[PDB]
Amino acid sequence: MRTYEVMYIVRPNIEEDAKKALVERFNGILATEGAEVLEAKDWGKRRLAYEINDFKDGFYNIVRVKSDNNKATDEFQRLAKISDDIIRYMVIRED
Amino acid sequence: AISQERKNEIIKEYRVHETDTGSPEVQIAVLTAEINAVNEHLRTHKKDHHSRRGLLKMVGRRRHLLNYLRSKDIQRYRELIKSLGIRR
């Protein structure tokens, strides 16, 4: 009863294949210990409020995956702050 | 919290077929076993001060229930201060 709708923002100045690398990992990081991977949409390649290292935006998607163990999206969240290429990690609980 | 699966699976067990749930056994049974689990967030992250109220509130419930059942039978308080894990 705890959806880890693990959406995220990818890098901006890159190609589609980099989007695909990131999005297949962030669909996949969860499969181990409970996948239920539903779809994969590719949302706005848009900007945001202020600058993020001379730039201000990135790439988006839509990732429907749930994990009741609560440890598959921690992976998605702990391995993000460190590398400036994964610039934000905001998931939900569709409880 | 103890996910409601935990509540309902443990609660059906700690009272014999005296024809329902909710004895002076299983009520406090769930209450105190939940204490024991929540004591970790009172120990592991041992900065927890406010479920130190949901805890001691039902401790006082458990205590006013516990301090008088010597007269229900010999075996309730005898075997059940054994059949509960809690002091005295």
Place this chain on the structure above:
Amino acid sequence: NIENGVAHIRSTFNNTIVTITDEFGNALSWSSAGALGFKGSKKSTPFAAQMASETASKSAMEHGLKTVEVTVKGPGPGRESAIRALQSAGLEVTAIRDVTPVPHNGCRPPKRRR
């Protein structure tokens, strides 16, 4: 002084920094309340800032700026006398941004005279 100007003007309640610049920081010209003699509560006042921009526009003599697309930051009452009077050669206050000092209650405040 490149054939255009951009107004990064400022006015703390004291030292109304009238500053018509270019887009980068290439130092076109500046002004003041401390540029035309006023001190005695005529510093940021409408009757003491009548000609506050011509210590800039005609101490330019080669540009005669032509626009703002202004960022009226550092607001006061000296703002108005630093915009409407920024039209004394054709300096053409044209656009605004509604971005003045608006910090977000993270700072710590200096003191209060009773």
Place this chain on the structure above:
Amino acid sequence: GITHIDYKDTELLKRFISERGKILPRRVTGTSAKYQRMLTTAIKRSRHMALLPYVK
């Protein structure tokens, strides 16, 4: 009135939104307190990503 809106959406929170990237007060609005609370909450799950500015 509406059904749910969550951090899938960030501009279905533009009906009640300002020009700086924030939202208007609920007192000036006045609809389903519960529904409007979660609806506005998701936009703040989005000020995480901050798709809507703080100042320009």
Place this chain on the structure above:
RNA sequence: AGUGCAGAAGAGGAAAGUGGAAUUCCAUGUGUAGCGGUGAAAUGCGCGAGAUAUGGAGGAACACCAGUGGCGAAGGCGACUUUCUGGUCUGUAACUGACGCUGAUGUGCGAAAGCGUGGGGAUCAAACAGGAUUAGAUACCCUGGUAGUCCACGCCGUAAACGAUGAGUGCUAAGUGUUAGGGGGUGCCCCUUAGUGCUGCAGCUAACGCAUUAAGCACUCCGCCUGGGGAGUACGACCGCAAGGUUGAA
């Protein structure tokens, strides 16, 4: 009645800081006459600080859903990616057939500071360096300035705990603002099995206030109080890392 409970709320609590008020620092995309200073100025950064922000991660707070809303016994209280967690119980109560009330034994524990790690500066605030004053200033004033300002570990307790309200039994108009959540229900009328804040019938207290949701009238305990000081000063008994307490004739 308590555990069953839909679970469900609200800043009840534990959630790293990915990002952002990113700060007085400065070659700086940019440069010098100003970031800036005021009852009265020096204070004060310029013999190569500047103006706001191009790299701007960081010391950190959710800044915006933030309301007087409401978890909880008072001190409180704000996105969450959420790491966890009880009760509270809103409807009747399935089980047992009194399932006991104030509670000096114990335990105790409770505001910044005072307190415990070294971090200790984002550097403001004490001292004040310093100007200045009507006849009258080390000053509420003024840039800057050494505890502290950025804390995951020993224990606490004085405050207008000004909440100066101590807790069992109902209560003589109920509406009313309404609360997540609801007894009959189905953006339409609601009643407490309920909750709050009340304009306030009604009746008492003492001049006042409470009021279907009561200081009034009836069964309650630790109790204090019974004209003022001085008086906590001889002196004092026992807790105790510390502010210290906590006692006690005249």
